[PDB]
């Protein structure tokens, strides 16, 4: 398995799955270093974010637990096809300075907070993280290049 990936069996259903302890991704499907990667993200802030305000909400009051529930719900909608990542980033990301559909551009190691950096470089192109936690809030990361 690629870096960070492990195999597991669901206790509740008996189905095998795969999870990545660097990106926090988990999937039923079987999975398959550059100086820079390019990623988009969707950020959900919470009351303990370093800056609990955004272009879409003047005063962010939700708890970290509530932010995590929103993030997991957005992941579910992306995987089911109910919504695409770019629409949810445009509609709901609390990050004002990324492009609306999520693009952060390219970056190197040493520039972003370690959990976000490690997740970004452990994704292959086209792969999406699970919930990734930083001082800014909780992130869904989509590697594009």
């Amino acid at each position: 398995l690629p870096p960070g990936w492990e195999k597991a069996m669901s206790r509740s259903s008996g189905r095998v799955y795969y999870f990545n302890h660097i990106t926090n991704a988990s999937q039923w499907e079987r999975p398959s270093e550059p100086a820079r990667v390019r990623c988009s993200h969707l950020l959900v802030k919470h009351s303990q974010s370093r800056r609990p305000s955004s272009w879409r909400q003047e005063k962010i009051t939700r708890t970290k637990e509530e932010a995590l529930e929103l993030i997991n719900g957005y992941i579910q909608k992306i995987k089911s096809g109910e919504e695409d990542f770019e629409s949810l980033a445009s509609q709901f990301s609390d990050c004002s300075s990324a492009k609306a559909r999520g693009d952060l551009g390219a970056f190197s190691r040493g520039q972003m907070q370690k959990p976000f950096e490690d997740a970004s470089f452990a994704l292959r192109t086209g792969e999406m993280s699970g919930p990734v936690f930083t001082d800014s809030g909780i992130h869904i990361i989509l590697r594009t290049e």
Side-chain angles (χ1 to χ4, degrees):
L1 297 176
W5 284 103
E6 294 180 334
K7 193 181 196 178
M9 201 185 81
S10 166
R11 293 167 294 170
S12 63
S13 70
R15 193 188 282 176
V16 165
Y17 66 98
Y18 304 85
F19 69 89
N20 190 299
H21 62 83
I22 310 173
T23 69
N24 290 340
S26 61
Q27 53 188 245
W28 310 116
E29 32 276 305
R30 188 188 327 262
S32 225
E33 187 175 280
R36 306 211 294 170
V37 294
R38 187 183 187 170
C39 295
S40 301
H41 79 149
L42 188 169
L43 172 66
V44 177
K45 288 183 173 189
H46 52 77
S47 68
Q48 302 125 90
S49 289
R50 63 180 296 269
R51 270 88 228 263
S53 59
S54 78
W55 68 279
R56 67 182 304 274
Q57 174 166 43
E58 298 185 349
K59 174 195 187 65
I60 298 180
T61 60
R62 69 177 68 90
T63 69
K64 186 179 180 181
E65 296 67 34
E66 284 166 340
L68 179 57
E69 183 184 15
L70 286 162
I71 284 283
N72 282 326
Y74 296 145
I75 289 169
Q76 193 280 336
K77 288 182 171 182
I78 296 166
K79 288 184 168 208
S80 73
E82 192 179 345
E83 303 276 11
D84 42 62
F85 168 95
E86 297 80 9
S87 302
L88 294 177
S90 177
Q91 298 166 354
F92 298 117
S93 182
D94 283 311
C95 177
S96 318
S97 54
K99 293 184 175 299
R101 293 176 290 167
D103 182 38
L104 298 168
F107 55 94
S108 302
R109 286 201 178 267
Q111 293 193 285
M112 315 297 189
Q113 283 209 301
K114 186 171 202 300
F116 187 100
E117 170 183 312
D118 287 344
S120 297
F121 279 84
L123 297 163
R124 281 82 56 80
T125 300
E127 286 186 319
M128 188 174 68
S129 71
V132 173
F133 294 71
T134 72
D135 292 350
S136 295
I138 312 180
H139 308 252
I140 303 165
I141 307 171
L142 174 64
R143 179 173 170 204
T144 56
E145 308 175 8

CSV table of all heavy atoms in Angstrom, one decimal, residues 20 22-23 33-39 41 104 107-124 129 132-135 139 141 143:
chain,number,residue,atom,x,y,z
A,20,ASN,N,-6.0,5.9,5.7
A,20,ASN,CA,-4.7,6.6,5.7
A,20,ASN,C,-4.5,7.4,6.9
A,20,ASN,O,-5.2,8.4,7.2
A,20,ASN,CB,-4.5,7.4,4.4
A,20,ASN,CG,-3.1,7.9,4.2
A,20,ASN,OD1,-2.6,8.6,5.0
A,20,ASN,ND2,-2.5,7.5,3.0
A,22,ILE,N,-2.1,9.5,7.6
A,22,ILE,CA,-1.6,10.9,7.3
A,22,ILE,C,-2.6,11.8,6.8
A,22,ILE,O,-2.6,13.0,7.2
A,22,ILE,CB,-0.4,10.7,6.4
A,22,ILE,CG1,0.6,9.6,6.8
A,22,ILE,CG2,0.4,12.1,6.3
A,22,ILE,CD1,1.7,9.4,5.9
A,23,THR,N,-3.5,11.3,5.9
A,23,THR,CA,-4.5,12.2,5.3
A,23,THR,C,-5.9,12.0,6.0
A,23,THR,O,-6.8,12.8,5.7
A,23,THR,CB,-4.7,11.8,3.8
A,23,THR,OG1,-5.2,10.5,3.7
A,23,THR,CG2,-3.3,11.8,3.1
A,33,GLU,N,9.2,12.1,-4.2
A,33,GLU,CA,8.3,13.2,-3.7
A,33,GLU,C,8.6,14.5,-4.5
A,33,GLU,O,9.8,14.9,-4.5
A,33,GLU,CB,8.4,13.4,-2.2
A,33,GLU,CG,7.5,14.4,-1.6
A,33,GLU,CD,7.5,14.5,-0.1
A,33,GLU,OE1,7.0,13.6,0.6
A,33,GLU,OE2,8.2,15.4,0.4
A,34,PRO,N,7.6,15.2,-5.1
A,34,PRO,CA,7.9,16.4,-5.8
A,34,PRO,C,8.2,17.5,-4.9
A,34,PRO,O,7.9,17.5,-3.7
A,34,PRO,CB,6.6,16.7,-6.5
A,34,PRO,CG,5.5,16.1,-5.6
A,34,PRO,CD,6.2,14.8,-5.0
A,35,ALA,N,8.9,18.5,-5.4
A,35,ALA,CA,9.2,19.7,-4.6
A,35,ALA,C,8.0,20.4,-4.2
A,35,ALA,O,7.9,20.9,-3.0
A,35,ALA,CB,10.2,20.7,-5.4
A,36,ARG,N,7.0,20.5,-5.0
A,36,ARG,CA,5.7,21.2,-4.7
A,36,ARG,C,4.5,20.4,-5.1
A,36,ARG,O,4.6,19.6,-6.1
A,36,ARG,CB,5.7,22.5,-5.4
A,36,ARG,CG,6.9,23.4,-5.2
A,36,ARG,CD,6.6,24.9,-5.2
A,36,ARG,NE,6.1,25.4,-6.5
A,36,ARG,CZ,5.6,26.6,-6.7
A,36,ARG,NH1,5.4,27.4,-5.7
A,36,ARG,NH2,5.3,27.0,-7.9
A,37,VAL,N,3.4,20.5,-4.4
A,37,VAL,CA,2.1,20.0,-4.8
A,37,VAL,C,1.2,21.2,-4.9
A,37,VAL,O,1.4,22.3,-4.3
A,37,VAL,CB,1.6,19.0,-3.8
A,37,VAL,CG1,2.4,17.7,-3.8
A,37,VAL,CG2,1.5,19.6,-2.4
A,38,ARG,N,0.1,21.0,-5.6
A,38,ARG,CA,-1.0,22.0,-5.7
A,38,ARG,C,-2.2,21.4,-5.1
A,38,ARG,O,-2.6,20.2,-5.4
A,38,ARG,CB,-1.2,22.4,-7.2
A,38,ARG,CG,-2.2,23.6,-7.3
A,38,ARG,CD,-2.5,23.9,-8.7
A,38,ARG,NE,-3.3,25.1,-8.9
A,38,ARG,CZ,-3.5,25.7,-10.1
A,38,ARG,NH1,-2.9,25.2,-11.2
A,38,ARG,NH2,-4.2,26.8,-10.1
A,39,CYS,N,-2.9,22.1,-4.2
A,39,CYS,CA,-4.1,21.6,-3.6
A,39,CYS,C,-5.1,22.6,-3.5
A,39,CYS,O,-4.9,23.8,-3.5
A,39,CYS,CB,-3.8,21.1,-2.1
A,39,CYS,SG,-2.7,19.7,-2.0
A,41,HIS,N,-8.7,23.3,-1.0
A,41,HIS,CA,-9.3,22.9,0.2
A,41,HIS,C,-10.6,23.5,0.5
A,41,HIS,O,-11.0,24.5,-0.1
A,41,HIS,CB,-8.4,23.1,1.4
A,41,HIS,CG,-8.3,24.5,2.0
A,41,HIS,ND1,-8.1,24.7,3.3
A,41,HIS,CD2,-8.4,25.7,1.4
A,41,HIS,CE1,-8.0,26.0,3.5
A,41,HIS,NE2,-8.2,26.6,2.4
A,104,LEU,N,-5.5,26.7,-3.5
A,104,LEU,CA,-4.4,27.4,-2.8
A,104,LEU,C,-3.2,27.6,-3.6
A,104,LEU,O,-2.2,28.3,-3.1
A,104,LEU,CB,-4.0,26.6,-1.5
A,104,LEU,CG,-5.2,26.3,-0.5
A,104,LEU,CD1,-4.7,25.3,0.5
A,104,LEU,CD2,-5.5,27.6,0.2
A,107,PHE,N,2.7,24.7,-3.3
A,107,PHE,CA,3.5,25.1,-2.2
A,107,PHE,C,4.5,23.9,-1.9
A,107,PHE,O,4.3,22.8,-2.4
A,107,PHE,CB,2.7,25.3,-0.9
A,107,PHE,CG,1.7,24.2,-0.6
A,107,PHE,CD1,2.0,23.2,0.3
A,107,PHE,CD2,0.5,24.2,-1.2
A,107,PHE,CE1,1.1,22.2,0.7
A,107,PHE,CE2,-0.5,23.2,-0.9
A,107,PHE,CZ,-0.1,22.2,0.1
A,108,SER,N,5.5,24.3,-1.1
A,108,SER,CA,6.6,23.3,-0.7
A,108,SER,C,6.5,22.9,0.7
A,108,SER,O,5.7,23.5,1.5
A,108,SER,CB,8.0,24.0,-1.0
A,108,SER,OG,8.1,24.4,-2.3
A,109,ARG,N,7.3,21.9,1.1
A,109,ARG,CA,7.4,21.6,2.5
A,109,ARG,C,8.0,22.8,3.2
A,109,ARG,O,8.8,23.6,2.7
A,109,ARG,CB,8.2,20.4,2.7
A,109,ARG,CG,7.4,19.1,2.4
A,109,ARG,CD,8.0,17.8,3.0
A,109,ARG,NE,7.3,16.6,2.7
A,109,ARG,CZ,6.4,16.1,3.5
A,109,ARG,NH1,5.9,16.7,4.5
A,109,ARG,NH2,5.9,14.9,3.1
A,110,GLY,N,7.5,23.0,4.5
A,110,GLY,CA,8.0,24.1,5.3
A,110,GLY,C,7.2,25.4,5.3
A,110,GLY,O,7.4,26.3,6.1
A,111,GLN,N,6.1,25.4,4.4
A,111,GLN,CA,5.3,26.6,4.3
A,111,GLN,C,4.0,26.5,5.1
A,111,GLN,O,3.5,27.5,5.6
A,111,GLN,CB,5.0,26.8,2.8
A,111,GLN,CG,6.2,27.2,2.0
A,111,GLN,CD,5.8,27.8,0.6
A,111,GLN,OE1,5.5,27.0,-0.3
A,111,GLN,NE2,5.9,29.1,0.5
A,112,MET,N,3.3,25.4,5.1
A,112,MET,CA,2.0,25.2,5.8
A,112,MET,C,2.2,24.4,7.1
A,112,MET,O,3.2,23.7,7.3
A,112,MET,CB,1.0,24.4,4.9
A,112,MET,CG,1.0,24.9,3.5
A,112,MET,SD,0.4,26.6,3.4
A,112,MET,CE,0.2,26.8,1.7
A,113,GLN,N,1.2,24.5,7.9
A,113,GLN,CA,1.2,23.8,9.2
A,113,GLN,C,1.4,22.3,8.9
A,113,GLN,O,0.8,21.7,8.0
A,113,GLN,CB,0.0,24.0,10.0
A,113,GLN,CG,0.0,25.4,10.7
A,113,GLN,CD,-0.7,25.4,12.0
A,113,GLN,OE1,-1.9,25.2,12.0
A,113,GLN,NE2,-0.1,25.7,13.1
A,114,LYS,N,2.2,21.6,9.7
A,114,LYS,CA,2.6,20.2,9.5
A,114,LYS,C,1.5,19.3,9.2
A,114,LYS,O,1.6,18.5,8.3
A,114,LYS,CB,3.4,19.7,10.7
A,114,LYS,CG,4.0,18.3,10.4
A,114,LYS,CD,5.0,18.0,11.5
A,114,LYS,CE,6.0,16.9,11.1
A,114,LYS,NZ,5.3,15.6,10.7
A,115,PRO,N,0.3,19.3,9.9
A,115,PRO,CA,-0.7,18.3,9.6
A,115,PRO,C,-1.2,18.5,8.1
A,115,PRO,O,-1.5,17.5,7.4
A,115,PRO,CB,-1.8,18.6,10.6
A,115,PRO,CG,-1.1,19.2,11.7
A,115,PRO,CD,0.0,20.0,11.1
A,116,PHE,N,-1.4,19.7,7.7
A,116,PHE,CA,-1.9,20.0,6.4
A,116,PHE,C,-0.8,19.7,5.3
A,116,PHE,O,-1.1,19.1,4.3
A,116,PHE,CB,-2.3,21.5,6.3
A,116,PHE,CG,-3.0,21.9,5.1
A,116,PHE,CD1,-4.3,22.0,5.0
A,116,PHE,CD2,-2.2,22.2,3.9
A,116,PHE,CE1,-5.0,22.4,3.8
A,116,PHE,CE2,-2.8,22.5,2.7
A,116,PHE,CZ,-4.2,22.6,2.7
A,117,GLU,N,0.4,20.1,5.6
A,117,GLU,CA,1.5,19.8,4.7
A,117,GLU,C,1.6,18.2,4.5
A,117,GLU,O,1.7,17.7,3.4
A,117,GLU,CB,2.8,20.3,5.3
A,117,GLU,CG,4.1,19.8,4.5
A,117,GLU,CD,5.4,20.3,5.2
A,117,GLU,OE1,5.4,21.5,5.4
A,117,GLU,OE2,6.3,19.4,5.5
A,118,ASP,N,1.7,17.5,5.6
A,118,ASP,CA,1.8,16.0,5.5
A,118,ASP,C,0.7,15.4,4.7
A,118,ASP,O,0.9,14.5,3.9
A,118,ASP,CB,2.0,15.4,6.9
A,118,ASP,CG,3.3,15.7,7.6
A,118,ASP,OD1,4.3,16.1,6.9
A,118,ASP,OD2,3.4,15.4,8.8
A,119,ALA,N,-0.5,15.8,5.0
A,119,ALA,CA,-1.7,15.3,4.3
A,119,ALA,C,-1.5,15.6,2.8
A,119,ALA,O,-1.8,14.7,2.0
A,119,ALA,CB,-3.0,15.8,4.8
A,120,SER,N,-1.2,16.8,2.5
A,120,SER,CA,-1.1,17.2,1.1
A,120,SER,C,-0.1,16.4,0.3
A,120,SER,O,-0.4,16.0,-0.9
A,120,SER,CB,-0.8,18.7,1.0
A,120,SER,OG,-1.8,19.6,1.6
A,121,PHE,N,1.1,16.2,0.9
A,121,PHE,CA,2.1,15.4,0.1
A,121,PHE,C,1.8,13.9,0.1
A,121,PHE,O,2.4,13.2,-0.8
A,121,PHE,CB,3.5,15.7,0.7
A,121,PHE,CG,4.1,17.0,0.2
A,121,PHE,CD1,3.8,18.2,0.8
A,121,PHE,CD2,4.9,17.0,-0.9
A,121,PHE,CE1,4.3,19.4,0.3
A,121,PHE,CE2,5.4,18.2,-1.4
A,121,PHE,CZ,5.1,19.4,-0.8
A,122,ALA,N,1.0,13.4,1.0
A,122,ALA,CA,0.6,12.0,1.0
A,122,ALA,C,-0.5,11.7,0.1
A,122,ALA,O,-0.8,10.5,-0.2
A,122,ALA,CB,0.3,11.6,2.5
A,123,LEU,N,-1.3,12.7,-0.3
A,123,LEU,CA,-2.3,12.5,-1.4
A,123,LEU,C,-1.6,12.3,-2.7
A,123,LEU,O,-0.6,13.0,-3.0
A,123,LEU,CB,-3.2,13.6,-1.5
A,123,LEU,CG,-4.1,13.9,-0.2
A,123,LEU,CD1,-4.7,15.3,-0.3
A,123,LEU,CD2,-5.2,12.9,-0.2
A,124,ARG,N,-2.1,11.4,-3.5
A,124,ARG,CA,-1.7,11.4,-4.9
A,124,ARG,C,-2.6,12.4,-5.7
A,124,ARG,O,-3.7,12.8,-5.2
A,124,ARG,CB,-1.8,10.0,-5.6
A,124,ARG,CG,-0.5,9.1,-5.3
A,124,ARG,CD,-0.6,8.5,-3.9
A,124,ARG,NE,-1.8,7.7,-3.8
A,124,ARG,CZ,-2.0,6.5,-4.2
A,124,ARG,NH1,-1.1,5.8,-4.9
A,124,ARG,NH2,-3.2,5.8,-4.1
A,129,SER,N,-8.5,14.2,1.0
A,129,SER,CA,-8.2,13.8,2.4
A,129,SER,C,-9.5,13.5,3.1
A,129,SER,O,-10.6,13.8,2.7
A,129,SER,CB,-7.5,14.9,3.1
A,129,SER,OG,-8.4,16.0,3.4
A,132,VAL,N,-8.8,17.1,8.2
A,132,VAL,CA,-7.4,17.4,8.6
A,132,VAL,C,-7.5,18.6,9.5
A,132,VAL,O,-8.2,19.6,9.2
A,132,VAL,CB,-6.5,17.7,7.4
A,132,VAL,CG1,-5.2,18.2,7.9
A,132,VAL,CG2,-6.4,16.4,6.6
A,133,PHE,N,-6.9,18.6,10.7
A,133,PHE,CA,-7.0,19.6,11.7
A,133,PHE,C,-5.8,20.5,11.8
A,133,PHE,O,-4.7,20.0,11.8
A,133,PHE,CB,-7.2,19.0,13.1
A,133,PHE,CG,-8.5,18.2,13.3
A,133,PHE,CD1,-8.7,17.0,12.7
A,133,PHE,CD2,-9.5,18.7,14.2
A,133,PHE,CE1,-9.9,16.3,12.9
A,133,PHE,CE2,-10.7,18.0,14.3
A,133,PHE,CZ,-10.8,16.8,13.7
A,134,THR,N,-6.0,21.8,11.8
A,134,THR,CA,-5.0,22.8,12.0
A,134,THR,C,-5.5,23.9,12.9
A,134,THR,O,-6.6,23.9,13.4
A,134,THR,CB,-4.5,23.5,10.7
A,134,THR,OG1,-5.6,24.4,10.3
A,134,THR,CG2,-4.2,22.5,9.6
A,135,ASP,N,-4.6,24.9,13.2
A,135,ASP,CA,-5.0,26.1,14.0
A,135,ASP,C,-6.1,26.9,13.3
A,135,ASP,O,-6.8,27.6,14.0
A,135,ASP,CB,-3.8,27.0,14.2
A,135,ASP,CG,-2.8,26.4,15.1
A,135,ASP,OD1,-3.0,25.4,15.7
A,135,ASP,OD2,-1.7,27.0,15.2
A,139,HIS,N,-10.2,20.9,7.7
A,139,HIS,CA,-10.0,21.0,6.3
A,139,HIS,C,-10.4,19.7,5.6
A,139,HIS,O,-10.1,18.6,6.1
A,139,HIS,CB,-8.5,21.3,5.9
A,139,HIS,CG,-7.9,22.4,6.6
A,139,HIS,ND1,-7.6,23.6,6.0
A,139,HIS,CD2,-7.5,22.6,7.9
A,139,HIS,CE1,-7.1,24.4,6.8
A,139,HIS,NE2,-6.9,23.8,8.0
A,141,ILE,N,-9.0,18.4,2.0
A,141,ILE,CA,-7.9,18.7,1.0
A,141,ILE,C,-8.1,17.9,-0.2
A,141,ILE,O,-8.2,16.7,-0.2
A,141,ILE,CB,-6.5,18.5,1.6
A,141,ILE,CG1,-6.4,19.2,3.0
A,141,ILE,CG2,-5.4,19.0,0.6
A,141,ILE,CD1,-5.1,18.8,3.7
A,143,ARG,N,-5.9,17.2,-3.7
A,143,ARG,CA,-4.7,17.5,-4.4
A,143,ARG,C,-5.0,17.5,-5.9
A,143,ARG,O,-5.6,16.6,-6.5
A,143,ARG,CB,-3.6,16.4,-4.1
A,143,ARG,CG,-2.3,16.7,-4.9
A,143,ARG,CD,-1.1,15.8,-4.5
A,143,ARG,NE,-0.1,16.0,-5.5
A,143,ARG,CZ,0.9,15.1,-5.8
A,143,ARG,NH1,1.0,14.0,-5.1
A,143,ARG,NH2,1.7,15.4,-6.7
